[PDB]
Amino acid sequence: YPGADAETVQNTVTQVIEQNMNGIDHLMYMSSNGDSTGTATITLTFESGTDPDIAQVQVQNKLALATPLLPQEVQQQGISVEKASSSFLMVVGVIN
Amino acid sequence: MPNFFIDRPIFAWVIAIIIMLAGGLSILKLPVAQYPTIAPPAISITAMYPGADAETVQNTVTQVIEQNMNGIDHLMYMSSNGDSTGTATITLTFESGTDPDIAQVQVQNKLALATPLLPQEVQQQGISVEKASSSFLMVVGVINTNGTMNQDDISDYVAANMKDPISRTSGVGDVQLFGSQYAMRIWMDPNKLNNFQLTPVDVISALKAQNAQVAAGQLGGTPPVKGQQLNASIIAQTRLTNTEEFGNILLKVNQDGSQVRLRDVAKIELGGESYDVVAKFNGQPASGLGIKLATGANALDTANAIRAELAKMEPFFPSGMKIVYPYDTTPFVKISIHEVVKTLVEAIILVFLVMYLFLQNFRATLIPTIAVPVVLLGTFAVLAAFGFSINTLTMFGMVLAIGLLVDDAIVVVENVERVMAEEGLPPKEATRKSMGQIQGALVGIAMVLSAVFIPMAFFGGSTGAIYRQFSITIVSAMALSVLVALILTPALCATMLKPITGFFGWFNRMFDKSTHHYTDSVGNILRSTGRYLVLYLIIVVGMAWLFVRLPSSFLPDEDQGVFLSMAQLPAGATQERTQKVLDEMTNYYLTKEKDNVESVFAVNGFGFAGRGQNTGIAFVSLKDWSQRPGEENKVEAITARAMGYFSQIKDAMVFAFNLPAIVELGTATGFDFELIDQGGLGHEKLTQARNQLFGMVAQHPDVLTGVRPNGLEDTPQFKIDIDQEKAQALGVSISDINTTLGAAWGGSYVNDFIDRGRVKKVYIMSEAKYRMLPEDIGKWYVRGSDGQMVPFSAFSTSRWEYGSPRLERYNGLPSLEILGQAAPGKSTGEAMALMEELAGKLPSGIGYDWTGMSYQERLSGNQAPALYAISLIVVFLCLAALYESWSIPFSVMLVVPLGVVGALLAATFRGLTNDVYFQVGLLTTIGLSAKNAILIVEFAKDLMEKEGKGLIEATLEAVRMRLRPILMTSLAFILGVMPLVISSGAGSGAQNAVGTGVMGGMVTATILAIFFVPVFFVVVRRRFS
Amino acid sequence: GTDPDIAQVQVQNKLALATPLLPQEVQQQGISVEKASSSFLMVVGVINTNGTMNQDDISDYVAANMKDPISRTSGVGDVQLFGSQYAMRIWMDPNKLNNFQLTPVDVISALKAQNAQVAAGQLGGTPPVKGQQLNASIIAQTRL
Amino acid sequence: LGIKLATGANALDTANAIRAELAKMEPFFPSGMKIVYPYDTTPFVKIS
Amino acid sequence: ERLSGNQAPALYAISLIVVFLCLAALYESWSIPFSVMLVVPLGVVGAL
């Protein structure tokens, strides 16, 4: 949500999405945060064993009922849903 | 096995204990819901186009989405409709059993690619893709006792401080809101706008620019200048929040020098997003949340949590609010579940008492009391393995199985009891000999019964979903019972049993006399087998004659405590007139039925058939069952009284009706017809065809009855014609008239704003008093090229014409929903087929198609005889294996008509129907009518083959041996399921259907079988030497 | 062996991050993400014995009344059409346009202004004023 | 119409359904119009 | 880490019982398994 303070992005974007994301199958805990840059990322952690591919479908499916309520600007930017990993597998440094 | 565990009692207990623990653990994890998934998955695509006529939602929204719905897997039929309020839905029904989650995302994805094609307003309002198959767990409604705030305030509060905690509760899979939060509403004023030389386009432009947001970036963000020491983000113009701040929006600066602010040209207030629906509660404003249930969560538990969380926030409600629950399904589930456990515990007591009446020893009656519960707990583990969930179907599919469980415990124990007393063998050795007589038969019973219930599970459509619940429960329970009757009961019998006046002394004396007389009667019959074979034909025709005469239904209706009440007003009736009917409709319930009706959720402007200002609903909630004694205060009686009174109402087609048994589906009674327009003739020509069909079904009043439309008849509608030539002459852009006309009257959604930590819409719309009559069109002014305003009367011609407030489509082509039902005494198959012939002579290019239940019945009906051709043959093969012959199995199969006759006679006399419960009711009677016959024959064959006794002598001994275990099975089972017939309280519609079919069938199955199986065995054996 | 349906979701999930960046003309025409092999399963030809219809009148009927149901039948990924559905063609005349001092931009504006169908609210729609007695939808110009 | 096959779907099962769908459209064809199948590989999956 | 500790008592309680049932089945007595299940504390104390 470009050009949005941390307080405003938290109240408008994250609050709306986080409301319409409770009730997924095998939901363990839900974390979210929005920073001054305007990026508001929500990370869901499913119960160990849930088929990760299917979990994305449910999360992606539910987000559709929430996209209209977000500010008009957010829709243009687009919302990305993809399985996330906390730490790097490796790093490939390039030097001259 | 029986001879392996007999001397290994401990190893039997361990397997019994493991099974018991499996049930205990799985009882605490199994989901509980009123019904399982029955209806096929359905996806609804709702799109709002504010202030749009009925046609427009079709030619720009519904059609465009339909054209782009390509390449979706397992799509069964697509239907849609666009009403006059701007809302169009496209319900896609998929194949039964398809993963709904994958189905929904596929439907959404195609919509996502087609979103750009839709108009700008539709995209701005957003298109919602939901699941329509699921049903509400409960509908919690909040009211306003003091009447100090309208529904909008209540709806806004609910969306802000009640929707969050409820949606975070355990098991709440989806929360819907029956309202709209606040939305800054701007009430324009044509009189004031013309004074200041303004137009609605100017108002829109100012709002779109003076409530925006900016990305100021950073102060000293990368890349910096060398030596920087500070870095902080920049905050630029931010949205407005106060209604006063909106008023100050500067709209125009007069040439003189004065200011023209918005507040001086339009009233501003916090209103609702939509005033289409006006909810009420006993005459007070209200709004509610439609709480659904997540997949795999205790329905009883979740409704307990929700009612507990709302107790936390009870003090925090602003003074005047209160929480009410017009519609809830967990109280009914509580009754429908406990009533079953009251039967599964009454059967155990009855079996304990029944055996104690015959055997007269405590140690004997303790063997079933430990062998029946082990199976009941065991089947839960097997039931939980397949993923099933406790519900009204499986439970009523398990009360039917209690008969199977008992007869697999009475036979094993009773036979052992007979041997000890006749042969005198010790308890540890009597079981070895006793189980040597029926170990083969019991294993055979498992296959034969497994060959009668398994085919039921292979049906298709909605019926297959209901049948699959009964078959798996009965099969699982039956399979375990045989296993637990071959592993555990023999161990208990030997270990527990011991070697061997008043009432019991008299009873034995009388019973001994009876059984001796019974053998005399069969002896007389077997000498004249020819005469009694005639009676077997006079009984089979009776079965066939009565079976056809039995009406066919789907599921019985039950007093769920809530019943709807439609309300339809003539064409064009406004909101005020409807609310007058909905008030005298709510007054009757609270005046003539004050002792039964609890509340009336008098919704307005909403209807199932259609939507508009001339429709209404009232979810009437009745008092608890305990406060409604007798049949005079049931839903069936109350609806009849209300229907009689509402026939006197003028200017309203009011009519009340009870909910369906499974609210997820529709009525599921009758037929569903689509009158497609294949040739592109147009809507007007299509209606001419429907009227032709309606005027031609009248020739067949004895087959088709109550054939009515489901849409809305065309009604007058204002038509405004913009004279293109005149507009150019006066220098007014046609793109400006379309906005002033479309924004002043239809309302527009300019942009969003932030308030109290939430984002809310801003709507502009003319004041209510300036957009009412046709004369008001001339009251609106639009700026010309030179700045001089012109009125709509100068370049607009208006006239009244007819149109359809609710257009409809089907599979992409126009249609006209037609509903109805078959005439009394005529099957839906003939009524359904008659319509095809009638619809086949309509003008060219007008086809048809069956949807809803009829489309499913057009597929399930094919498998009705085919599945029982496999079942009958496989059963015969199993029997031929058990008896080691081809001719003997005829005797076993021929008792099937005996069992059915009792059920049909009882059902017909009680005036029941051939519903789903009854059909399963026959199977257990048929299943438990052969289980008593398979042992009579196998004993006769055993005696004849080993001891060599003559045929007639062998059969007489066989019937004498098996007279006790037949009676205790029938006497205990009939007494066990007698409560289910006398029951008249909550959830009695299902209980009566199951109870009557079983008790009636069992009585004639027991009486006739013990007189006929010996006749069949001798006749079959005689002829097939 | 990859689940073909799960693959499409991920492919189209990523495509939704780039669709806004595409030119408007592409979005209006519509971009379809199909899961179909490049080889044709079969071809359903259509002809007319009379011969009155040309290679386009037949094409319209295939698209109008036949193409849509086929593309939805379970087990069909893509249904290409060997022709073109009808579409009102405006054959412009540069010799005449210059004569009347016009341009294609003016013609585009005229089509959007006049061949446009506008939502027009209702007569006394909600919220009404006490004493109302009639409610009828308003209709303005529609698609030509 | 050049019909393609969705990945993972049976070739002969789909072709059986498509020929069933057209049967519901043949009756309403205007005068002269007729359906001819100039190319289909499914029969080879059946005759073979 | 918290979840590991919470379900630890159930893991030992249910594993001990299953052995008792499995031992009793093999030894056809409710006492001899009670004479082999009394050595586990002599084993656990070794690990601690």
mmCIF file of N, CA and C in Angstrom, chain B residues 261-323:
data_model
loop_
_atom_site.group_PDB
_atom_site.id
_atom_site.type_symbol
_atom_site.label_atom_id
_atom_site.label_comp_id
_atom_site.label_asym_id
_atom_site.label_seq_id
_atom_site.Cartn_x
_atom_site.Cartn_y
_atom_site.Cartn_z
ATOM 1 N N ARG B 261 -18.832 25.869 -0.118
ATOM 2 C CA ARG B 261 -18.416 24.617 0.493
ATOM 3 C C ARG B 261 -19.488 23.549 0.300
ATOM 4 N N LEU B 262 -19.068 22.289 0.439
ATOM 5 C CA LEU B 262 -19.990 21.179 0.225
ATOM 6 C C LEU B 262 -21.148 21.223 1.213
ATOM 7 N N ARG B 263 -20.863 21.520 2.483
ATOM 8 C CA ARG B 263 -21.916 21.529 3.493
ATOM 9 C C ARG B 263 -23.019 22.525 3.167
ATOM 10 N N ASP B 264 -22.735 23.524 2.337
ATOM 11 C CA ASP B 264 -23.738 24.491 1.914
ATOM 12 C C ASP B 264 -24.491 24.051 0.666
ATOM 13 N N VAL B 265 -24.197 22.867 0.133
ATOM 14 C CA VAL B 265 -24.826 22.400 -1.098
ATOM 15 C C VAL B 265 -25.350 20.979 -0.915
ATOM 16 N N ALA B 266 -25.077 20.372 0.239
ATOM 17 C CA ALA B 266 -25.500 18.996 0.463
ATOM 18 C C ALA B 266 -25.396 18.598 1.929
ATOM 19 N N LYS B 267 -26.465 18.021 2.473
ATOM 20 C CA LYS B 267 -26.415 17.471 3.819
ATOM 21 C C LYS B 267 -25.472 16.277 3.859
ATOM 22 N N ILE B 268 -24.714 16.167 4.948
ATOM 23 C CA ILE B 268 -23.736 15.102 5.127
ATOM 24 C C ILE B 268 -24.016 14.411 6.453
ATOM 25 N N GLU B 269 -24.051 13.082 6.431
ATOM 26 C CA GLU B 269 -24.304 12.302 7.633
ATOM 27 C C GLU B 269 -23.723 10.912 7.438
ATOM 28 N N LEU B 270 -23.550 10.202 8.549
ATOM 29 C CA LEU B 270 -23.065 8.827 8.526
ATOM 30 C C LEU B 270 -24.262 7.898 8.357
ATOM 31 N N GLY B 271 -24.401 7.318 7.164
ATOM 32 C CA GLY B 271 -25.490 6.411 6.870
ATOM 33 C C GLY B 271 -24.976 5.022 6.537
ATOM 34 N N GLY B 272 -25.894 4.193 6.044
ATOM 35 C CA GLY B 272 -25.541 2.845 5.664
ATOM 36 C C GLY B 272 -25.153 2.732 4.202
ATOM 37 N N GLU B 273 -24.441 1.647 3.888
ATOM 38 C CA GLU B 273 -24.048 1.404 2.505
ATOM 39 C C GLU B 273 -25.265 1.170 1.621
ATOM 40 N N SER B 274 -26.241 0.411 2.116
ATOM 41 C CA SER B 274 -27.423 0.065 1.337
ATOM 42 C C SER B 274 -28.643 0.052 2.242
ATOM 43 N N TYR B 275 -29.723 0.682 1.780
ATOM 44 C CA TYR B 275 -31.001 0.683 2.478
ATOM 45 C C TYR B 275 -31.989 -0.305 1.869
ATOM 46 N N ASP B 276 -31.499 -1.285 1.107
ATOM 47 C CA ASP B 276 -32.397 -2.213 0.430
ATOM 48 C C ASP B 276 -33.206 -3.033 1.427
ATOM 49 N N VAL B 277 -32.562 -3.525 2.482
ATOM 50 C CA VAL B 277 -33.185 -4.420 3.449
ATOM 51 C C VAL B 277 -33.277 -3.702 4.788
ATOM 52 N N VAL B 278 -34.439 -3.793 5.425
ATOM 53 C CA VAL B 278 -34.681 -3.208 6.738
ATOM 54 C C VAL B 278 -35.083 -4.342 7.669
ATOM 55 N N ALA B 279 -34.162 -4.758 8.531
ATOM 56 C CA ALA B 279 -34.424 -5.832 9.474
ATOM 57 C C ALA B 279 -35.125 -5.293 10.715
ATOM 58 N N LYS B 280 -35.834 -6.185 11.402
ATOM 59 C CA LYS B 280 -36.555 -5.820 12.611
ATOM 60 C C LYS B 280 -36.699 -7.051 13.491
ATOM 61 N N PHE B 281 -37.050 -6.812 14.754
ATOM 62 C CA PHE B 281 -37.139 -7.881 15.747
ATOM 63 C C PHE B 281 -38.250 -7.500 16.722
ATOM 64 N N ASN B 282 -39.424 -8.107 16.549
ATOM 65 C CA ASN B 282 -40.602 -7.772 17.346
ATOM 66 C C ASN B 282 -40.954 -6.292 17.231
ATOM 67 N N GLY B 283 -40.620 -5.680 16.100
ATOM 68 C CA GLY B 283 -40.898 -4.274 15.891
ATOM 69 C C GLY B 283 -39.784 -3.335 16.286
ATOM 70 N N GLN B 284 -38.570 -3.841 16.486
ATOM 71 C CA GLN B 284 -37.430 -3.029 16.876
ATOM 72 C C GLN B 284 -36.292 -3.242 15.891
ATOM 73 N N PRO B 285 -35.430 -2.245 15.701
ATOM 74 C CA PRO B 285 -34.327 -2.408 14.750
ATOM 75 C C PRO B 285 -33.344 -3.459 15.232
ATOM 76 N N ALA B 286 -32.663 -4.093 14.280
ATOM 77 C CA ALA B 286 -31.742 -5.162 14.633
ATOM 78 C C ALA B 286 -30.813 -5.455 13.466
ATOM 79 N N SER B 287 -29.725 -6.153 13.783
ATOM 80 C CA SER B 287 -28.812 -6.692 12.789
ATOM 81 C C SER B 287 -28.166 -7.933 13.382
ATOM 82 N N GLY B 288 -27.689 -8.820 12.507
ATOM 83 C CA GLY B 288 -27.211 -10.110 12.963
ATOM 84 C C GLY B 288 -26.032 -10.609 12.159
ATOM 85 N N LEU B 289 -25.368 -11.614 12.722
ATOM 86 C CA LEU B 289 -24.240 -12.285 12.093
ATOM 87 C C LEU B 289 -24.634 -13.716 11.764
ATOM 88 N N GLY B 290 -24.377 -14.135 10.529
ATOM 89 C CA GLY B 290 -24.628 -15.508 10.147
ATOM 90 C C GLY B 290 -23.398 -16.368 10.336
ATOM 91 N N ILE B 291 -23.330 -17.076 11.455
ATOM 92 C CA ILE B 291 -22.159 -17.873 11.801
ATOM 93 C C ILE B 291 -22.273 -19.236 11.137
ATOM 94 N N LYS B 292 -21.230 -19.628 10.417
ATOM 95 C CA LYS B 292 -21.136 -20.948 9.824
ATOM 96 C C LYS B 292 -20.225 -21.812 10.694
ATOM 97 N N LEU B 293 -19.927 -23.024 10.229
ATOM 98 C CA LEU B 293 -19.138 -23.980 10.993
ATOM 99 C C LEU B 293 -17.965 -24.461 10.154
ATOM 100 N N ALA B 294 -16.781 -24.488 10.758
ATOM 101 C CA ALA B 294 -15.601 -24.989 10.074
ATOM 102 C C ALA B 294 -15.695 -26.500 9.890
ATOM 103 N N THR B 295 -14.991 -26.997 8.878
ATOM 104 C CA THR B 295 -15.007 -28.423 8.579
ATOM 105 C C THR B 295 -14.282 -29.190 9.678
ATOM 106 N N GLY B 296 -15.019 -30.034 10.395
ATOM 107 C CA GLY B 296 -14.431 -30.851 11.438
ATOM 108 C C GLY B 296 -14.351 -30.152 12.779
ATOM 109 N N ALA B 297 -15.489 -29.675 13.277
ATOM 110 C CA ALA B 297 -15.545 -29.026 14.577
ATOM 111 C C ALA B 297 -16.866 -29.377 15.243
ATOM 112 N N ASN B 298 -16.823 -29.572 16.558
ATOM 113 C CA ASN B 298 -18.022 -29.931 17.304
ATOM 114 C C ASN B 298 -19.061 -28.824 17.195
ATOM 115 N N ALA B 299 -20.189 -29.133 16.553
ATOM 116 C CA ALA B 299 -21.261 -28.150 16.448
ATOM 117 C C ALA B 299 -21.798 -27.782 17.824
ATOM 118 N N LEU B 300 -21.972 -28.774 18.697
ATOM 119 C CA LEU B 300 -22.424 -28.489 20.055
ATOM 120 C C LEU B 300 -21.405 -27.641 20.804
ATOM 121 N N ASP B 301 -20.117 -27.947 20.637
ATOM 122 C CA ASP B 301 -19.079 -27.214 21.354
ATOM 123 C C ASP B 301 -18.967 -25.780 20.855
ATOM 124 N N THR B 302 -18.919 -25.592 19.533
ATOM 125 C CA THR B 302 -18.717 -24.255 18.986
ATOM 126 C C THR B 302 -19.845 -23.317 19.397
ATOM 127 N N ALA B 303 -21.092 -23.785 19.306
ATOM 128 C CA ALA B 303 -22.212 -22.971 19.759
ATOM 129 C C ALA B 303 -22.141 -22.695 21.252
ATOM 130 N N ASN B 304 -21.442 -23.541 22.011
ATOM 131 C CA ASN B 304 -21.211 -23.250 23.420
ATOM 132 C C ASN B 304 -20.177 -22.144 23.583
ATOM 133 N N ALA B 305 -19.122 -22.169 22.766
ATOM 134 C CA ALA B 305 -18.098 -21.132 22.848
ATOM 135 C C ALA B 305 -18.648 -19.773 22.434
ATOM 136 N N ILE B 306 -19.416 -19.726 21.343
ATOM 137 C CA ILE B 306 -19.944 -18.450 20.866
ATOM 138 C C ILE B 306 -20.844 -17.825 21.922
ATOM 139 N N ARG B 307 -21.730 -18.627 22.513
ATOM 140 C CA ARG B 307 -22.589 -18.129 23.578
ATOM 141 C C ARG B 307 -21.810 -17.774 24.835
ATOM 142 N N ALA B 308 -20.553 -18.205 24.941
ATOM 143 C CA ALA B 308 -19.707 -17.836 26.067
ATOM 144 C C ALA B 308 -18.911 -16.567 25.790
ATOM 145 N N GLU B 309 -18.378 -16.422 24.574
ATOM 146 C CA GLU B 309 -17.656 -15.203 24.230
ATOM 147 C C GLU B 309 -18.575 -13.991 24.279
ATOM 148 N N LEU B 310 -19.800 -14.128 23.766
ATOM 149 C CA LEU B 310 -20.744 -13.019 23.822
ATOM 150 C C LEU B 310 -21.078 -12.645 25.259
ATOM 151 N N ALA B 311 -20.966 -13.597 26.188
ATOM 152 C CA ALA B 311 -21.151 -13.269 27.597
ATOM 153 C C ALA B 311 -20.020 -12.390 28.114
ATOM 154 N N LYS B 312 -18.820 -12.531 27.546
ATOM 155 C CA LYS B 312 -17.707 -11.680 27.951
ATOM 156 C C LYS B 312 -17.979 -10.220 27.615
ATOM 157 N N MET B 313 -18.552 -9.962 26.443
ATOM 158 C CA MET B 313 -18.789 -8.605 25.970
ATOM 159 C C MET B 313 -20.150 -8.059 26.377
ATOM 160 N N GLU B 314 -20.946 -8.822 27.125
ATOM 161 C CA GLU B 314 -22.265 -8.334 27.522
ATOM 162 C C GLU B 314 -22.187 -7.004 28.256
ATOM 163 N N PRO B 315 -21.312 -6.814 29.246
ATOM 164 C CA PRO B 315 -21.243 -5.500 29.905
ATOM 165 C C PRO B 315 -20.843 -4.373 28.972
ATOM 166 N N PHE B 316 -19.999 -4.646 27.975
ATOM 167 C CA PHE B 316 -19.457 -3.594 27.125
ATOM 168 C C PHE B 316 -20.444 -3.089 26.083
ATOM 169 N N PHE B 317 -21.574 -3.758 25.894
ATOM 170 C CA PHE B 317 -22.553 -3.284 24.928
ATOM 171 C C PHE B 317 -23.054 -1.902 25.342
ATOM 172 N N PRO B 318 -23.105 -0.930 24.432
ATOM 173 C CA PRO B 318 -23.714 0.357 24.782
ATOM 174 C C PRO B 318 -25.151 0.160 25.237
ATOM 175 N N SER B 319 -25.577 0.988 26.187
ATOM 176 C CA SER B 319 -26.895 0.822 26.785
ATOM 177 C C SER B 319 -27.973 0.784 25.711
ATOM 178 N N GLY B 320 -28.829 -0.230 25.786
ATOM 179 C CA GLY B 320 -29.917 -0.421 24.846
ATOM 180 C C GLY B 320 -29.784 -1.647 23.967
ATOM 181 N N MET B 321 -28.603 -2.251 23.890
ATOM 182 C CA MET B 321 -28.410 -3.417 23.044
ATOM 183 C C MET B 321 -28.706 -4.702 23.816
ATOM 184 N N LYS B 322 -28.888 -5.784 23.064
ATOM 185 C CA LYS B 322 -29.185 -7.094 23.626
ATOM 186 C C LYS B 322 -28.956 -8.131 22.538
ATOM 187 N N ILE B 323 -28.534 -9.324 22.950
ATOM 188 C CA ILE B 323 -28.212 -10.405 22.025
ATOM 189 C C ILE B 323 -29.353 -11.411 22.030
#
